[PDB]
């Protein structure tokens, strides 16, 4: 994988640096990599593909080294160069995707095509150039077995689920209390809802609790926790929980009381926020626990009054709610957010090539399936796929 | 690597290897003996040159023998003449000019 | 126990030594098993 | 830790190796390990302690070399090496504990106290010597991330949980269904009672299951499975699950018929056994599903059809229980196990010193939380502390 | 065998001495094996597998022998011997593997795999090394027809048996004496019942015997022996001898009386413990005979008195019943004890390459089939692969 | 004692090490100290036996040195060496069994037989090699006066003790309070009952103590703590204290409330732990402390009200237990375990060979009495011949 990073940093390196004009004194030490890099690679075979409908390809390297005498470059010089950059991209190109379209349900950290495994060999090992990208800097960290993180905007760590609990029910859903939510990517929404608006409740207060457990825990988030679930503030009519009929949910927003956000990583509160809204930080957590309360307006002018009575016909019914989202964060492992492009790197290679669905990852590579069973096994196989999906991407655009 | 084995000293596995007939590439720059001799290929004399590393403990006497057979060879008639196939066991590395 | 368990400060076992309610108070919100279970026993004891 | 490690190695073969009457062909190379040992601390300050009640202690080294002039140890040589052993083993005993007392949440595995920082310097690499026990050979293993391998008699992997599961009852717990269970170490009993003893049941068959995760995969386990659990056979008085009453238990035992225990790896069976009793093997797995069911039997005695009625009055409550111990086994991770003394030797030394209750473990070294929440950081923390007490474990007796 | 323990012995010592920094002087002797290993090695070809689904593989040895150091070896050494060491190991993993997925019906203490065989030619006799392993130990004593020794903690010696024996019976099953038991693994519990509580008996005294035969004889055994049978002890409902129906136990525990414990050899009473409970040893049987009593208590209190009269209806049936487990002890065969891995690693290595049954073990390596059957060519079959078993271990986690 | 397991020692690594083909490099020191230890033994003559049937033996020794100038070797040199080590062998487990089978009231530790009289002079010394044993280990720190220490795996502290306290009792055995226990090997069942239930104890709780002391002081002891007593939950028929008639005991088991266990050490609290389950760990403890309460519960459903009544006519009686087992502990005298058989060899010569019971241990070695009153007289004469019996185990199988 280093061997692999390292020709893909070097052809682009080429590609940038190797232009018409140019002081050979800019160049110099890439000419250097560049030539170590060909003799390295002279005289070795190599086979790609024959996964799905991945074309099977075989590489020859019968190269001649680049010039090292010129004071500035020419045309000459750019256009020798690019005839060996093209094929070595390409090279690099289907490498990559063999490695992406591959998996392994033991051991799926190491390579699993056989062109990666021929250059895990040490005589490779002389093309090392540069480890300085996120994803391999993490990697070289992991095998030195020191920290490693991601960091991450908006990371969808949340497995999509939208789904309510009713703790009081009745077959004609005329008189409800519960909580609905919506947990999905990097956002939680989250509303408490009773018909009755507490009216006899004790001390008229009622108590949701939400808690979301993540597969992976997050340090130094940023988050914006703000007051209202603007998702479940319109009038819905939802299906039963057994699906058999259908309810309605005619919402009227309240303030939710005593707002309390913990961050708890095994089961200890390290952060805990109590009625703040705005920009909060959780240093680390692994679990996200929302208390909020609906409490009855003690006073109330006509208007509200009438809204809520005290029996059992209930047109409005009171919901309070809270919004989660976590803008940024570390991990330590790799997970998919808004700004990178890996994930979709790799699912766009395997629905292209057609792979087969393999034994490790979920069809299609749903995210939410993978994120919702995030295994051992997964997370190493991911790991590899989206290192080799960023040295693809540092070449093809 | 005939260097790192001068260096070292110990011949173990050189001997053990040339005792026992077992594949083996010495890699360094030798300077080779070229005969132009079908009677000498057919005599298999490009075998008897190894013999002296395990009697000496030196490879600086090593001397490959290239067979360079061609038509201004003196014994060419022989592998004109007859039905078979040239053959050497050992190989020189070596490159052909530019 | 709450020494071996957790090694309280000096500043902490001196207080609850004395017996001071500023630290057992600490110590209840903090949520220790061992102060709570002490304290409940207490007011259980405490029947009639 | 290897360094640390090889000073202990070298200190026990020392102590073992070097008494008088012994040819010097039996230690001449152990006393060139002594030496070299020696002359790398010699000149070097080393501080300990200074947390909780561990006490600050200084250690200066300037010491000789022992002698090589002799064909056989007498009793001075014996003397002078083990007065300067003494001192050794002294220092090696409180670096060992002040890194056991120490935890960190990032870089768990590195070297924490000041002593173990210094020694992870490049110029005490001289001394190594060989790393031959388990635990610094997993050590060094996961430190190159290969496959580690941890052998436990009786591994403790299960928290503590005695609980109950009803899927029948009613206020007055007169005629309930369910099932019962004690997790505890490596060892659990299932039992799932029914009042009615399936007069009602289609089939007259009642199903039970029981679902145990492990938090850590093990392989290559022995395991022990009986047909009934001795731990629910008797009367009980069991609290509600509310806890508002109790309700009363008056088991009679049957045999469990169609017993089904399938040991599953990320959900796929890797094992499975049927009516199959006594010493079983599970070569991967994560997670133990235990099926039986409660048939009433065809054909009753007298004796037993005044015991089973139709009516609801019922006295005795049919039940079919399960035993499963894991006898040994292997896992990735380090567990406290049965056989090792290493969760008791960092738990006597924290408590001894009274260390104060740190940002990972939790208090006290408290087995059913640390196995509970399992998180690698934790892993991380314990291993080191386990190597720590394993090579204190090789001098201090 | 002796040279793939020379092998993997061999192996386990570079691994664990040839580390950075070690002086030259400790690992002296472990390169000159490691030379000569490489030496007889170089230009053997070797084949592996090719049975069930254990994938055909060719090793071929091509490597130079490892170097030397003036004082102190470092990270290029390592790194170059480890590349060696890292080929070797997974050849005698897949040696060993090749040889425990076989067997053989005639001649099991025969090699059965082509790489054995090639092993134990000639040739390769200067890789032996020492053998210092108990298994490899016991199998040069066992190929020398030298006494051998195993010692087991809780060995596996008894088929899995519960079953029970009713010496009076009658169709309603309502006046049963006899006695139930439990022979699992290392325990045997045995408890005799009588449900007229000896009323009707001679010196009102029942005598009950269990007579449990070994297959293998156990030396120097320590065995714990307690008075009760807890599994026996609570209410059953169990099926008649015939199938046809069931029938009531709701037993009521007595002390049991005269309790004699015979540890007998070839039917001759080696050792005799009289009413003796808690730790005994048996230095040499094949049977054990535990023989007791229930004597009616001569003056019983109104309570007691209420359990048994004098006529039929016997609602509380009197039971003594006995526990013995052998803590250790020591086998001149193999057997499946509860701290080893050898059983587990057998049957991983089978299930998980599919291996198809053979000639010789019961299906999936069950333990109670090969206990109650457990022939020379079985032990012969059974001693080679746990040896194998043991050898591959020292290299694999 | 030192020059016998020196004997034991070079003997056993001549039957590892000295084997067919392997290098002479690797047995080149094994040689010199099997040489130095024939001629350290050549022209002596030894006795031993003439206790019990123990048959008089007599030994010379003239045996010629072994060669030095073989390259690899040979059947030959194997044969040669194997003759030597027969008859050596055959002498080091005479010695042993005759030392095994002595005893002495006071200066137990010296040797006792004059084999081993004779091998303690200073001529002998030169036969030293290495004491790596864990039990020679303890005898050499033993003599040198510093601390020592046994690791044991359920280890054999409690002396057995199989009784019933009554606090509350009548001739009628019908309303009863106390406690019943077993402390057996290393686990103490203990069960506190009340057959009214606590209806009149004061606050509705029934107090209940348990102490079990220790000979010996453990450390650094890993235990499980449970919190119902199996062997004491079924109906018993006990005799009375006198013995003149028998008492009913038809338990129904509540939860044990307000359980504490304490582990001190000379009367002074070291441990505590309140109402906690599964692992602990008690880091130095010679006394344990079990206290747990009976409460009635305050709320019972009809079939758990029916069960206790207001008056006399007690059916079911309540009682609540605890188990505690003792997994491993490290103590500096030596104990029988589970684990080692040492106990069961020193027991097993004396019981073949009918040595007449000493002035020492209790006759046939029990257990039970020698842990009952272990005199410091028996700690002596019990480490000396379970050394001795180590000794003789790493030779004889
Ligand atoms: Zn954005
Ligand atoms: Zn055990």
């Not at chain 2, 360094?28 to 004399?45: C, E, R």
Request: glycine content about 4%.
């Amino acid at each position: 994988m280093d061997v692999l990073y390292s020709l893909s940093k070097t052809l682009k390196d080429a590609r940038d640096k190797i232009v018409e004009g140019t002081l050979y004194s800019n160049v110099s030490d890439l000419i250097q990599q560049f030539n170590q890099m060909i003799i390295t690679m002279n005289g070795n075979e190599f086979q790609t593909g024959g996964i799905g409908n991945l074309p099977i390809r075989n590489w020859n390297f019968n190269f001649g080294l680049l010039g090292t005498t010129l004071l500035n470059l020419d045309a000459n010089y750019v256009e020798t160069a690019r005839n060996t950059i093209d094929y070595f991209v390409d090279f690099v190109d289907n490498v990559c995707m063999d490695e992406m379209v591959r998996e392994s349900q033991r051991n799926g950290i190491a390579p699993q095509s056989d062109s990666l495994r021929k250059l895990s060999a040490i005589k490779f090992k002389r093309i090392n150039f540069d480890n300085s990208s996120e994803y391999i800097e993490n990697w070289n960290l992991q095998n030195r077995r020191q920290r490693t993180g991601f960091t991450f905007h908006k990371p969808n760590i949340f497995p999509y689920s939208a789904s309510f609990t009713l703790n009081r029910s009745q077959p004609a859903h005329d008189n409800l209390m519960g909580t609905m939510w919506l947990n999905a990517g990097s956002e939680i929404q989250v509303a408490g809802f009773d018909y009755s608006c507490a009216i006899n409740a004790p001390a008229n207060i009622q108590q949701f609790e939400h808690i979301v457990p993540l597969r992976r825990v997050l340090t130094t988030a940023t988050i914006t926790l703000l007051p209202d679930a603007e998702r479940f503030s319109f009038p819905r009519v939802i299906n039963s929980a057994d699906g058999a009929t259908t309810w309605f949910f005619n919402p009227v927003i309240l303030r939710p009381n005593n707002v309390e956000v913990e961050f708890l990583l095994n089961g200890q509160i390290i952060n805990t926020y109590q009625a703040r809204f705005g920009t909060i930080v959780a240093r680390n957590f692994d679990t996200i626990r929302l208390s909020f309360q609906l409490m009855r307006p003690p006073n109330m002018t006509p208007a509200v009054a009438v809204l809520f009575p005290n029996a059992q016909p209930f047109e409005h019914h009171a919901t309070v709610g809270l919004t989660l989202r976590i803008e940024s964060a570390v991990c330590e492992s790799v997970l998919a957010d808004a700004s990178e492009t890996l994930l979709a790197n790799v699912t766009s290679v395997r629905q292209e090539y057609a792979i087969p669905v393999g034994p490790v990852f979920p069809p299609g590579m749903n995210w939410t399936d993978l994120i919702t069973n995030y295994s051992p096994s997964r997370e190493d196989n991911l790991q590899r796929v989206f290192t080799v999906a960023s040295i693809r991407s540092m070449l093809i655009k | 690597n005939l260097e790192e084995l001068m260096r070292t000293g110990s011949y173990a596995q050189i001997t053990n290897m040339l005792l026992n007939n077992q594949p083996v590439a010495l890699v360094g720059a030798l300077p080779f003996v070229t005969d132009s001799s079908v009677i000498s290929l057919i005599a298999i004399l490009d075998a008897t040159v190894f013999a002296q590393i395990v009697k000496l403990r030196k490879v600086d006497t090593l001397k490959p023998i290239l067979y360079k057979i061609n038509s201004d060879s003196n014994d060419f008639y022989l592998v004109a003449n007859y039905d078979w196939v040239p053959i050497s066991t050992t190989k020189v590395y070596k490159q052909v000019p530019v | 126990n709450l020494n071996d368990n957790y090694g309280i400060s000096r500043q902490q076992a001196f207080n609850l030594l004395r017996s001071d309610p500023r630290v057992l108070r600490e110590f209840i919100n903090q949520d220790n098993p061992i102060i709570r279970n002490r304290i409940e026993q207490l007011i259980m004891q405490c029947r009639l």
